[PDB]
C-alpha cells in the first residue's frame, strides 16, 4: 500500500517534445532488486529495450577475510558480472522513436549501500498523453507509483514559483523581451561523439590520449517539458551549461559515514585495477551506477556502498554518471 506519487506537468498549448517525471522510493533490500522490471498498465506500451538485459559490473566492499589483517579493519573489493534489467540505459535515438511510436520509456535508477537500495523511477512520455491524461498504474517490486497528470496554467511555459517561463534566447525572445533538468548517458561509437575531447577543452584537466576513452553523449530534458537536448553541442550554450553542471557537480545537487578508499577492476577480468571508488557506510546516498571512462565500449558499473571517482583531474581510474539531475541557469523571461 502507501502508494507514491509521480508528478507530471502538462502545458495548455503544445509546440518534437517529451515530458519527464521522477520519484525517489524508500529503501528496499538489495537482493530483491534482481530481475526487477517496471510493469506498466498505461495505454502507451513501454519500450521493449528497457526491459532487456544490460550486463553490469558489480563492485562491492567487505571486511578483509584474512585473520590478523582483519583485526586492522581493512576491507577489500570484489568485482563480478551481473545482469540488470529496467535500468535507465537508453540507446541512440530511442527517445525520438518512442515519441513517434506512442511508446513510453519507464526505467529506474538505483541508489544503494552495501545492503539496501533506494530506487528512483523515471518515466518519459510524449506530450500526446497530456490531452487524454489517462491515469496509469506502474508496479516496481514492492512499491506502487501513481501516474498523476497536472494541468499547469501556462500555455507553453514551465511554472517556476507561480510564474510561467519559456526559454528561447532566440530572436523571438528578443522581440518578446534555475530550471530542473534530468540527463541520461547514451553510449554510441562514432567520430562525432568525442566526449572527453570537449571535456579537456572545457575544464583544465590533464587528460591525454582521449581516443581510447568512452564515446557517447548525454540527452537531457529541461523543465519537465522540452525537446530533446544533446550534450555537449557547441552551438547550444544551454546544453553547454548542462555539460558544465554535469562536470562541475557530477554527483548531482542535494547520515553516511565514509569508510576507507578502494580500487577495483571494472571488467572483472582486467590485469590491474582500473577504477577508483570511495566505500561508505550509512543510509544509501548518491548514484550507484556509472560508466568507466577509460574504455571506448561502455563498461557499466554498479557499486553498492561505494562512491565512484567523478573528480576527473587525472583521467586514470575515472568514471562518469549514468544519470544526472540538477538545476542550471538559462536566459529567458516570464510571461506577462
Amino acid at each position, epitope marked *: 500500500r502507501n502508494v507514491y506519487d509521480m508528478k507530471i506537468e502538462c502545458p495548455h498549448t503544445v509546440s518534437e517534445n517529451s515530458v519527464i517525471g521522477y520519484v525517489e522510493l524508500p529503501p528496499m533490500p538489495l537482493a530483491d532488486t534482481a530481475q526487477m522490471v517496471p510493469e506498466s498498465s498505461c495505454s502507451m506500451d513501454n519500450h521493449q529495450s528497457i526491459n532487456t538485459i544490460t550486463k553490469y559490473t558489480q563492485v562491492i566492499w*567487505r571486511g578483509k577475510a584474512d585473520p590478523g*589483517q582483519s583485526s586492522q579493519n581493512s576491507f577489500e573489493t570484489v568485482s563480478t558480472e551481473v545482469d540488470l534489467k529496467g535500468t535507465c540505459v537508453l540507446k541512440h535515438k530511442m527517445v525520438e522513436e518512442s515519441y513517434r511510436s506512442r511508446k513510453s520509456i519507464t526505467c529506474y535508477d538505483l541508489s544503494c549501500n552495501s545492503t539496501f537500495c533506494k530506487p528512483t523511477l523515471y518515466m518519459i512520455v510524449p506530450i500526446h498523453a497530456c490531452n487524454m491524461m489517462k491515469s496509469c498504474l506502474i508496479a516496481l517490486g514492492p512499491y506502487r507509483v501513481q501516474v498523476v497528470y497536472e494541468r499547469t496554467y501556462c500555455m507553453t511555459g514551465v511554472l517556476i514559483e507561480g510564474k510561467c517561463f519559456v526559454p528561447d534566447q532566440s530572436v523571438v525572445s528578443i522581440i518578446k523581451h534555475s530550471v530542473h533538468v534530468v540527463c541520461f548517458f547514451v553510449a554510441v561509437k562514432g567520430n562525432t561523439y568525442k566526449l572527453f575531447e570537449q571535456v579537456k577543452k572545457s575544464f583544465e584537466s590533464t587528460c591525454n590520449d582521449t581516443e581510447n576513452k568512452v564515446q557517447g553523449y548525454y540527452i537531457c530534458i529541461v523543465g519537465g517539458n522540452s525537446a530533446p537536448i544533446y550534450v555537449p553541442t557547441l552551438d547550444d550554450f544551454r546544453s553547454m551549461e548542462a555539460f558544465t553542471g554535469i562536470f562541475k557537480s557530477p554527483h548531482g545537487e542535494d547520515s553516511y559515514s565514509i569508510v576507507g578508499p578502494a580500487n577495483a577492476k571494472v571488467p572483472h577480468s582486467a590485469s590491474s585495477d582500473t577504477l577508483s571508488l570511495i566505500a561508505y557506510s550509512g543510509i544509501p546516498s548518491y548514484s550507484s551506477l556509472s560508466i568507466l571512462t577509460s574504455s571506448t565500449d561502455a563498461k557499466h558499473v554498479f557499486s553498492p556502498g561505494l562512491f565512484p571517482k567523478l573528480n576527473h583531474t587525472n583521467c586514470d581510474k575515472s568514471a562518469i554518471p549514468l544519470t544526472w539531475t540538477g538545476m542550471i541557469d538559462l536566459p529567458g523571461y516570464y510571461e506577462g
Partner: antibody
Amino acid sequence: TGQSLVESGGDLVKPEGSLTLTCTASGFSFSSTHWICWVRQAPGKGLEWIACIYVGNTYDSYYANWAKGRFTISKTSSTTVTLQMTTLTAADTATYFCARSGSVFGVVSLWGPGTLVTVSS
Amino acid sequence: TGQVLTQTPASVSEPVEGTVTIKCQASQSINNWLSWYQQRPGQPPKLLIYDASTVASGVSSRFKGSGSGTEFTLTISDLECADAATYACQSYGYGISITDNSAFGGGTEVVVRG
C-alpha cells in the same frame, strides 16, 4: 596477540522455553567494517546459519529462513552481541558459535569455542 | 532459490605423508566464492582457504584449494598427524546473491593412518 570471541549462556532449558545467549570480544576493537553472526551445529548434523547483524553505527540484521521470527539478534555495546531464542524445541539442542565476518554471510575471519544449549525436560 | 551444498566423501582414511582429496559441489553456480574450515573437537574452527584459492595467513602451504563454478576440491599434501580433524566448505555470496547461495558443507572426517 590473541583475538577471539567468547560465547556465554547456554544452560539447560525446558521445551517451549526461552534462552538468551551472549557473545563477547576479547582484545579486539569492534570497528565499523565487521559483521557478527551465530552458527549452530547439532550432534550429527552440519553447520547451520542463524542470524547476523551489521554491528555498526547503523542498524542492519539478517535472519535465517527457519529461524526468522523465532530468534532475535541485536548488538549491545562496542564489544558484545546477544541472541534471543524463543520457544525452543528438542531440535534446537546444538552448539552455538560466535562468528565475525566482513560481509553478511561471507568468510568467517574468526570463530569462538562455542557454547552448548541443551533442550530437555 | 534453495541452494544446497554437497561435500564428499563423508569419511576418508589416508596414511601419513599421503594426500587427501575433499570434493565440495554446489547446487547453484558460485563464481569462485568458497571457504574451507578446519574444526578440531572442542576448538574454534580455523579458516584455511578463502576465495576457494587463497591461503590464510599463518596456514602452511601444504593446504591447496582449487576449483571454480559449481565444483571445488581441497588437497592436503604431506599429511601430518595434526591434520586429522573435521573439514567443511562454506558457500558465501556477495551483493545481490546474499543469502541466495549461503550454505554449509555436510562435513568430512579425516583419519590419518599411522
